[PDB]
Ligand binder design. Structure first.
Ligand SMILES: CCCCCCCCCCCCO[C@@H]1O[C@H](CO)[C@@H](O[C@H]2O[C@H](CO)[C@@H](O)[C@H](O)[C@H]2O)[C@H](O)[C@H]1O
Ligand SMILES: CCCCCCCCS[C@@H]1O[C@H](CO)[C@@H](O)[C@H](O)[C@H]1O
Ligand SMILES: CCCCCCCCS[C@@H]1O[C@H](CO)[C@@H](O)[C@H](O)[C@H]1O
Ligand SMILES: N[C@@H](Cc1ccccc1)C(=O)O
Ligand code: NA
Ligand code: NA
Length: 441
C-alpha cells in the first residue's frame, strides 16, 4: 500500500520544495564567497547543466520505474548487482546532511524568534557579528531550536506523503522568491554594487588553478539539487506515469539556479557595502542580512518575513532529507511511518549535536585533517557521498540498462536530447566527477 502524490502538481512541487532551501541562500553564499565568486559560479553553473540536470532526470526515472525506496530501487531493477551501494550511500548521506541541516535551520528559527520579540530591530551593542557568534558559541541554546526544527520535520514526514509532504503551502516558495528579488534590488543601491557584481560575475581564472574549487562546485551543485542520495528517487517513487520527467528536471534545476543567483545578487553587494570579507564563513548571511534589514525603515518586518519564508523552505528540504531513511527503514524492517520518522528523526537530531557544538566548545576538535566536526560531516556527505552516489546512479542507467528502456522510462525518444542525456550519464557526468575526484588528491 505505497503512497502516491494525490494531486497532479504534487510531484513537481515536492521536488522543487526539496531543491529550494538553505543551500540556495546560506550555503551558496558562503561557498561562493570563499571560492572566489564568478569563476567558481561559472563552473557551478556548468555542473548544473551538464551533470545536474541529467542525474536529476536519472533519479526521477529510477524512482518512478521501481516504485521503491532509494536502496530498494536498485534491488528491484538490478537484483543482486552492486548498484545498490548508491542507495546505501544515499541513506547514510541523509543521516549526515540532516544532522547539520537542522542546526542551520535552528539558526533560522532563533533569528525569527528574535525579530518577533523585537530583539534585533536595532543593532545590538556587540554588533550583528558579535550577536551571531555569541549565540552559536552557546552550547545549549542552538540545540533547543535545532530540536524544535526537527520536531516539525519529524511531524510532517510521520503524517505521510499525501497528508503531509504534499500539503505544503504553494505561496511560500513564490513569496520567498519575490522577497529575494525585492531584497536583491535594494542591496544594489547600497554603494558596493560595482565590486559586488564584479566579484560575482567578472571571473578571475587564477582561482580555477586549484582543484579544490572544482570539488566545491560539484558539491554545491549536488547539494542544491538534492542529488546523489536518492532523495529524488524517493519522491519520484510516489509518481505515476502521469508525469513528464524531462520538464520536471529542467524546471527543478532552472528554478533552483534562479534562487541561488538572486541570493548572490542580494548578499554580495551587501557584503562589499559593509566592507566585510565575502569568505567570512557559514555565518555570512546571518551577519550580513540583519545588517541590511537594519538599514531599512520597515526592516523588522522584512526580517520577520524573510526568516519565515526561509524557514518554510528549509522545512520542506529537511522533510525530503528525512524521507530517504524513513522509506528505507519502512520497507526493510517493516517499520511504520510514524515509528521510523520519530526514531530516525531523534537519532539524526542527536547526530547533529556534535556538529552544533563545533561552533563553540568543540571548535578545537578535528575529524578530517584541518576541519572541525561540522566541516568534516559536511565534507564527507557533500563532497564524497553525493558526487560518488550520483556517479554510480549515472553509470547505472548508462551502462546497466537497455538504451530503449532508459529513454522510454524517462519520457524521451531517440532524439538529439535523448542522445545527449544518454551521453551525459554514460560518459560526460561520470568522467567529470571522476576527474574532479582524482585531481583533488
Ligand atoms: C518560531 C517558533 C517559536 C516557538 C518557541 C517559543 C518559546 C521560546 C522559548 C524562549 C527560549 C529563549 O531562551 C533564552 O533566549 C535568550 C536569547 O533569546 C537568551 O538570552 C541571552 O543568552 C544568549 C547567550 O547566553 C545570547 O545569545 C542572547 O543574546 C542573550 O539574550 C537566554 O540565555 C535563553 O535562555
Ligand atoms: C520593490 C523593491 C524596490 C526596492 C528599492 C529600494 C531602494 C532604496 S533607495 C535608497 O535611497 C538613498 C538615497 O536617497 C540611498 O542612500 C540608499 O542607498 C538607497 O538604498
Ligand atoms: C541583476 C544585475 C545584473 C548585473 C550583471 C553585471 C555583470 C557585469 S560584472 C563586471 O563589472 C565590471 C565593471 O567594470 C567589468 O569590469 C566586468 O567586465 C563585468 O563583467
Ligand atoms: N537541496 C537542499 C539540500 C538537500 C540535499 C539533499 C537532499 C535534500 C535536500 C538545499 O539546497 O537546501
Ligand atoms: Na537548493
Ligand atoms: Na525547501
Amino acid at each position: 500500500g505505497r503512497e502516491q502524490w494525490a494531486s497532479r502538481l504534487g510531484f513537481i512541487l515536492a521536488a522543487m520544495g526539496s531543491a529550494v532551501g538553505l543551500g540556495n541562500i546560506w550555503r551558496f553564499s558562503y561557498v561562493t564567497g570563499e571560492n572566489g565568486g564568478a569563476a567558481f559560479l561559472l563552473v557551478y553553473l556548468g555542473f548544473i547543466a551538464l551533470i545536474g540536470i541529467p542525474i536529476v532526470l536519472a533519479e526521477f526515472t529510477i524512482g518512478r520505474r521501481a516504485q521503491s525506496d532509494a536502496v530498494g530501487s536498485f534491488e528491484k531493477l538490478a537484483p543482486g548487482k552492486p548498484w545498490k551501494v548508491a542507495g546505501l550511500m544515499g541513506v547514510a548521506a541523509g543521516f549526515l546532511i540532516l544532522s547539520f541541516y537542522g542546526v542551520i535551520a535552528g539558526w533560522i528559527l532563533f533569528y525569527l524568534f528574535n525579530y518577533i520579540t523585537g530583539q534585533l530591530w536595532s543593532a545590538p551593542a556587540e554588533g550583528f557579528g558579535g550577536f551571531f557568534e555569541g549565540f552559536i558559541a552557546n552550547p545549549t541554546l542552538p540545540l533547543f531550536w535545532q530540536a524544535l526544527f526537527m520536531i516539525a520535520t519529524i511531524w510532517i514526514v510521520a503524517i505521510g506523503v499525501k497528508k503531509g509532504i504534499e500539503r505544503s503551502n504553494k505561496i511560500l516558495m513564490p513569496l520567498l522568491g519575490v522577497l529575494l528579488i525585492a531584497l536583491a534590488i535594494y542591496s544594489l543601491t547600497l554603494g558596493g554594487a560595482k565590486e559586488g557584481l564584479a566579484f560575482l560575475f567578472s571571473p578571475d581564472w587564477s582561482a580555477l588553478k586549484d582543484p579544490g574549487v572544482y570539488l566545491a562546485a560539484i558539491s554545491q551543485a549536488f547539494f542544491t539539487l538534492s542529488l546523489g542520495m536518492g532523495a529524488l528517487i524517493t519522491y519520484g517513487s510516489y509518481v505515476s506515469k502521469d508525469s513528464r520527467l524531462p520538464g520536471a528536471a529542467v524546471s527543478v534545476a532552472g528554478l533552483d539556479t534562479a534562487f541561488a543567483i538572486i541570493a548572490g545578487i542580494m548578499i554580495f553587494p551587501a557584503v562589499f557595502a559593509l566592507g566585510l570579507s565575502p569568505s567570512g564563513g557559514p555565518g555570512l548571511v546571518f551577519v550580513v542580512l540583519p545588517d541590511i534589514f537594519d538599514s531599512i525603515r520597515l526592516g523588522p518586518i522584512v526580517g520577520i518575513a524573510f526568516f519565515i519564508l526561509l524557514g518554510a523552505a528549509a522545512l520542506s528540504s529537511a522533510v525530503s532529507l528525512l524521507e530517504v531513511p524513513v522509506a528505507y527503514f519502512m520497507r526493510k524492517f517493516d517499520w511504520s511511518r510514524k515509528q521510523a520518522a520519530i526514531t530516525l528523526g531523534v537519532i539524526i537530531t542527536l547526530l547533529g549535536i556534535p556538529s552544533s557544538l563545533s561552533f563553540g566548545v568543540l571548535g578545537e576538535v578535528t575529524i578530517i585533517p584541518g576541519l572541525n566536526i561540522f566541516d568534516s560531516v559536511d565534507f564527507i556527505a557533500s563532497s564524497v557521498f553525493l558526487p560518488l552516489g550520483g556517479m554510480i546512479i549515472a553509470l547505472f542507467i548508462g551502462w546497466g540498462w537497455k538504451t530503449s528502456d532508459a529513454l522510454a522510462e524517462s519520457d524521451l525518444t531517440d532524439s538529439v536530447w535523448g542522445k545527449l542525456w544518454i551521453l551525459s550519464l554514460r560518459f560526460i557526468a561520470p568522467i567529470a566527477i571522476l576527474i574532479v575526484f582524482l585531481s583533488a588528491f
